[PDB]
Amino acid sequence: EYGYIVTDQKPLSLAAGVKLLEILAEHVHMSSGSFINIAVVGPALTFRIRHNEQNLSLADVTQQAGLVKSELEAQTGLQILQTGVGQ
Amino acid sequence: EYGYIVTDQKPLSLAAGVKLLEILAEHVHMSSGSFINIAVVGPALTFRIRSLADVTQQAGLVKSELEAQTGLQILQTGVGQ
Ligand SMILES: [Ca+2]
């Protein structure tokens, strides 16, 4: 399974993708280094989550991504169209 | 915002989409009639609730039961805007 954030930017740049991860990491009080298996695919950012001191799960962080979508958008200029978990 | 489940079905039948919701409702302990704004579009089921995060998390928790009971594969579960 992987977490994902779909944007309105196709192709999404890898640098922009990891800016989203930085903002998300700040919000959930995790190091952004705990986002692993990262790739951008089309308009989407995909990732997994490493064992972390917060015991944050993939489900936790993607839910939070949806919750703080406005902040992600405000700081990057992207629109966040979908957040979720895939296989 | 809306919830969605992307399946491997091309396209997903309305009957199968609602069967997913029926099973999901039982797991979250609400009436399936509380799922509203329902549509199937391509391989995806979309819906709202009369939280979305709660139900999509639940859909991950019981993904194997959803797949086994409906005969399809769940490729993505999430919330859209
Ligand atoms: Ca902190």
Break chain B into its structural domains and give their ranges.
1-81
Cis ω before A11 (30° cut-off from 0): yes
CATH of domain B1-81: 3.30.70.2470
Interface test with A, best of B57, B61, B63 (most A CBs within 10 A): B57
CA dist., res. A12 & res. A44, Å (int)? 6
Give the phi and the psi of residue B38 in degrees, each rounded to 5.
Answer: -85, 135
- Cited resolution, angstroms: 1.5
d(CA B53, CA B4): 11
Distance CA B65, CA A46 (A): 25
How far is CA A29 from each of CA A4, A36, A53, A71, rounded to the nearest angstrom?
19, 16, 10, 15
Experimental method: X-ray
Dist. CA B62–CA B28, nearest whole Å: 10
Contacts of residue A80, Cβ cutoff 8 Å, sequence gap at least 6: A5, A6, A7, A65, A66, A69, A72, A73, B81
Residue showing tokens 């391989």 = B43
Element spanning A6, H or E: strand A2-7
Pairing of strands B2-7, B35-41: unpaired
Which residue type, as a one-letter code, is found at position A32?
Answer: S
Pairing status of strand B35-41 against strand A44-49: unpaired
**How crowded is residue A24: how many other Cβ atoms within 10 Å of its Cβ?**
26
| Cα–Cα–Cα angle for B47, A47, A19, rounded to 5 degrees | 100
3-state secondary structure of A54: coil
Of the candidates A26, A21, A27, A37, the residue with the CA atom closest to the CA atom of residue A80:
A21
Look at A84 and B75 and tell me if their CB atoms are within 8 Å.
no
| A67: chain B residues, CB-CB within 8 Å | 53
SS percent in chain B: helix, strand, coil, step 5? 45, 30, 25
Cis peptide before B11 (omega within 30 of 0): yes
| Residue among B51, B52, B55, B56 with most chain A CBs within 10 A, to mutate | B56
Strand positions, DSSP E, chain B: 2-7, 35-41, 44-49, 74-80
Cross-strand partners of B79: A83, B3
State the CB neighbour count (10 A cutoff) for residue B50. Answer: 9
Domain A1-87 grouped into CATH 1.20.1250.20:
no
> Would you list which residues of chain B are within 8 Å, Cβ to Cβ, of chain A?
1, 4, 6, 53, 56-57, 60, 74-81
Under 8 Å between Cβ of B4 and B67? no
**d(Cα A49, Cα B34) in Å, to the nearest integer?**
33
Q: Which residue from A4, A81, A87 is facing B81, i.e. has the nearest CB?
A: A81
